[PDB]
């Protein structure tokens, strides 16, 4: 089997992407944030504290003839940005782009933090990291991909995120029309439960490539590119007036600037992030200070190849017995 679904930016900045997901019988379609940095499929629901729901579409398990309470199971998750959610668990039928999993754990939120409430466009998350990170207790649950894998034509999914445009998540096949040149594959460590890999270096604009190993995670659920302070300083030094602002929470730059590109290495291959992808616009409405899309990972504890990086590539998440990651230009 295979599946193919369009993923759409939630706003004009590509802050996140939403993908429609069918849950239950008859189908209830919710728009979920596919997150290769976590491993829980959770939704706003009829159980979510009413004051914490503001415009989201909810899953109502009592209206699904295939929903079953997973008795005794609870979940609770905290994300790198400080947001969180928790609740109980149902199993139900879940379909993405025509690919159906029966008995998928659907984690129903009883509580969500303010950032989730305030984002009316995201109805929940669909985790695509390794199932070892799943938070359900006392019986850990599998991700949608893990459940689908054996049925797929090939044990892979691909992320093809757009810049200010829709893109695609495919399951079970590689669309050879969706990228240019060849796909370069690179090793993955699953030790921390992430799609963790090592970039071979970087360049700033038309500058020379610096060969250096940068360990990080491919994370579709993180907006920006978080890299070591040395690398980030070298990038922003090429933008007149750019500076790190403790008050704003990162590097800012004059909105009048033209940003240089940023290149990262994948083995001997190179992925070029155009300068425009690194512009996250005014820090506040009407400001002439703009927020940068490359930020320091210092104090996160891990480097993160978030959407800024991933949307410059066609990315293969290869879930074979020994997982790997592939990157192609597009």
From Swiss-Prot:
Q: Which GO terms describe its biological process?
A: proteolysis
Q: What EC identifiers does the entry list?
A: 3.4.23.22
Kindly state which keywords UniProt assigns to this record, in alphabetical order: Aspartyl protease, Disulfide bond, Hydrolase, Protease, Signal, Zymogen
- An example molecular function term from Gene Ontology annotations: aspartic-type endopeptidase activity
In this protein, which residues make up the domain named Peptidase A1? Answer: 17-328
* Disulfide bond positions: 255-290
Reactions that this protein is recorded to catalyse: Hydrolysis of proteins with specificity similar to that of pepsin A, prefers hydrophobic residues at P1 and P1', but does not cleave 14-Ala-|-Leu-15 in the B chain of insulin or Z-Glu-Tyr. Clots milk
**Residues the record marks as active site:** 35, 199
Family of the protein in this entry: Belongs to the peptidase A1 family.
Listed name of the protein: Endothiapepsin
The organism encoding this protein is Cryphonectria parasitica (Chestnut blight fungus)
Q: What is the lineage of its organism?
A: Eukaryota, Fungi, Dikarya, Ascomycota, Pezizomycotina
Q: Which residues of the full protein are shown?
A: 90 to 419 of 419
